[PDB]
UniProtKB/Swiss-Prot annotation, chains A, D:
Changing H58A: Strong reduction in ligase activity. Zn(2+) 1 binds at C23, C26, H61, C64. Belongs to the RING-box family. It catalyses: S-ubiquitinyl-[E2 ubiquitin-conjugating enzyme]-L-cysteine + [acceptor protein]-L-lysine = [E2 ubiquitin-conjugating enzyme]-L-cysteine + N(6)-ubiquitinyl-[acceptor protein]-L-lysine; S-[NEDD8-protein]-yl-[E2 NEDD8-conjugating enzyme]-L-cysteine + [cullin]-L-lysine = [E2 NEDD8-conjugating enzyme]-L-cysteine + N(6)-[NEDD8-protein]-yl-[cullin]-L-lysine. Signal peptide: none annotated. This is E3 ubiquitin-protein ligase RBX1. A zinc finger (RING-type) spans 34-79. It is found in: Cytoplasm; Nucleus. Component of multiple Cul1-RING E3 ubiquitin-protein ligase complexes commonly known as SCF (SKP1-CUL1-F-box) complexes, consisting of CUL1, SKP1, RBX1 and a variable F-box domain-containing protein. Part of a SCF(SKP2) complex consisting of CUL1, RBX1, SKP1 and SKP2. Part of a SCF(FBXO3) complex consisting of CUL1, FBXO3, RBX1 and SKP1; this complex interacts with PML via FBXO3. Component of the SCF(Cyclin F) complex consisting of CUL1, RBX1, SKP1 and CCNF. Identified in a SCF E3 ubiquitin ligase complex together with HINT1 and CDC34. (Microbial infection) Interacts with human adenovirus 5 protein E1A; this interaction inhibits RBX1-CUL1-dependent elongation reaction of ubiquitin chains by the SCF(FBW7) complex. Widely expressed. The chain holds residues 20 to 108 of 108 of the full protein. Zn(2+) 2 binds at C34, C37, C49, H63.
From Swiss-Prot, chain C:
The gene is CUL3. Forms neddylation-dependent homodimers. Component of multiple BCR (BTB-CUL3-RBX1) E3 ubiquitin-protein ligase complexes formed of CUL3, RBX1 and a variable BTB domain-containing protein acting as both, adapter to cullin and substrate recognition subunit. The BCR complex may be active as a heterodimeric complex, in which NEDD8, covalently attached to one CUL3 molecule, binds to the C-terminus of a second CUL3 molecule. Interacts with RBX1, RNF7, CYCE and TIP120A/CAND1. Part of the BCR(SPOP) containing SPOP, and of BCR containing homodimeric SPOPL or the heterodimer formed by SPOP and SPOPL. Neddylated. Attachment of NEDD8 is required for the E3 ubiquitin-protein ligase activity of the BCR complex. Deneddylated via its interaction with the COP9 signalosome (CSN) complex. It comes from Homo sapiens (Human). Belongs to the cullin family. It is linked to Pseudohypoaldosteronism 2E: An autosomal dominant disorder characterized by severe hypertension, hyperkalemia, hyperchloremia, hyperchloremic metabolic acidosis, and correction of physiologic abnormalities by thiazide diuretics. Core component of multiple cullin-RING-based BCR (BTB-CUL3-RBX1) E3 ubiquitin-protein ligase complexes which mediate the ubiquitination and subsequent proteasomal degradation of target proteins. BCR complexes and ARIH1 collaborate in tandem to mediate ubiquitination of target proteins. As a scaffold protein may contribute to catalysis through positioning of the substrate and the ubiquitin-conjugating enzyme. Brain, spermatozoa, and testis (at protein level). Widely expressed. High-glucose conditions in renal tubular epithelial cells lead to up-regulation of CUL3 expression, significant increase in CUL3-mediated ubiquitination of MRPL12 and dysregulation of mitochondrial biosynthesis. It is found in: Nucleus; Golgi apparatus; Cell projection, Cilium, Flagellum; Cytoplasm, Cytoskeleton, Spindle. This is Cullin-3.
Length: 89, 154, 77, 89
């Protein structure tokens, strides 16, 4: 051949079993609102109902784990202190 | 703040401007003093993290010693808050290089096909490094494709 | 002599250890490649400049093609 | 062919990124004097202004790192204790 690849420097991103189809706290989805918001509008009045990403690569609705912080303080699928490293998908 | 971040990235990518540490220390002190009388620190931190991603996901040997000085200056200027995210990103870079060592050990084990020649694969976490857009997709080299598939199997 | 020149000898032994480790590492990925018929039997030693003095002026001349390929593969690794 | 090579016992020497063109302590060169010597003669009065090699395969002017030993004690391009394994190029 005329051109051949010797080295590769790909970067691999990983995500845990967040179950994009069932929120691990509310069991609706990784998007499309939550149990306490339901309808899309539901008198939104600004604020937000996006996805929250932790330091453990877990994703839930911001509302779900914001409320869950009052019940416990360690991400339910593990035993790690939950951070708020990202907001939205 | 974006221009300040670009200036600090230009000063950090190479020590061409002053090989000795003395003038580097003085210019860094002047830069942080200038940053002290500045508002809108959120955009500054965001662009500093973007510059960190650009300089760590490219050719290394940037300084391999000034990162500690940068994090110390950040910890004494902003404090454990925005600088804590950069500490986490450095921990994630350590994670990636250890996983690269593990993949090299795996290639030494198998060592049968030409799928993984010098597969320098970096493993990062979604939270630290933002998505470029929506993880693009297209045809990739097949020997390295099977290498990536075996890395994914690991 | 005491802990003085013997420290240099210990450093030389450490350099020997480094050289053989870099040899087993080089080989591991030469077996993984196997491209050209130049790496049939290779024993490359990796040494540090400080421990072992330069011979005269680092001589250079054209290398036989099979050692050429072996050296190219080792340098790429 | 009549003669074929089976085994090879080459010895590979390695050097770190000493930057032969730009001294890491005085941005001059790996030879040709230093910042505090400048001119070739500069009242040499014997002594020496050769290259110093450490245990970490780093090379600087003897004057540069001899003075630098008073500022710090770990080779600037790394975190290793600097030795004096060789003197001169
Ligand atoms: Zn939910
Ligand atoms: Zn909601
Ligand atoms: Zn978690
Ligand atoms: Zn110098
Ligand atoms: Zn001098
Ligand atoms: Zn050194």
């Amino acid at each position: 051949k005329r051109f051949e690849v010797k080295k590769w420097n790909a970067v691999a991103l990983w995500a845990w079993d967040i179950v994009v189809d069932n929120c691990a706290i509310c069991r609706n989805h990784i998007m499309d609102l939550c149990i306490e918001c339901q309808a899309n509008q539901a008198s939104a009045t600004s604020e937000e109902c996006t996805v929250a990403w932790g330091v453990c690569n877990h994703a839930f609705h911001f509302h779900c784990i914001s409320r869950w912080l009052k019940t416990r303080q360690v991400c339910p699928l593990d035993n790690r202190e939950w951070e708020f490293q990202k907001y939205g998908h | 703040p974006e221009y300040l971040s670009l200036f600090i990235d230009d000063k950090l990518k190479k020590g061409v401007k002053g090989l000795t540490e003395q003038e580097v220390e003085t210019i860094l002190d002047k830069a942080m003093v200038l940053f002290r009388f500045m508002q809108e620190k959120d955009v500054f931190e965001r662009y500093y993290k973007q510059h960190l991603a650009r300089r760590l996901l490219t050719n290394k040997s940037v300084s391999d010693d000034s990162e500690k000085n940068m994090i110390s200056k950040l910890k004494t200027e902003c404090g454990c808050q925005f600088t804590s995210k950069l500490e986490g990103m450095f921990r994630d870079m350590s994670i990636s290089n250890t996983t690269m060592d593990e993949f090299r050990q795996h290639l030494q084990a198998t060592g049968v096909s030409l799928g993984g020649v010098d597969l320098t694969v970096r493993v990062l976490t979604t939270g630290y490094w933002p998505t470029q857009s929506a993880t693009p997709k297209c045809n990739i080299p097949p020997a390295p494709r099977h290498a990536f598939e075996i890395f994914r199997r690991f």
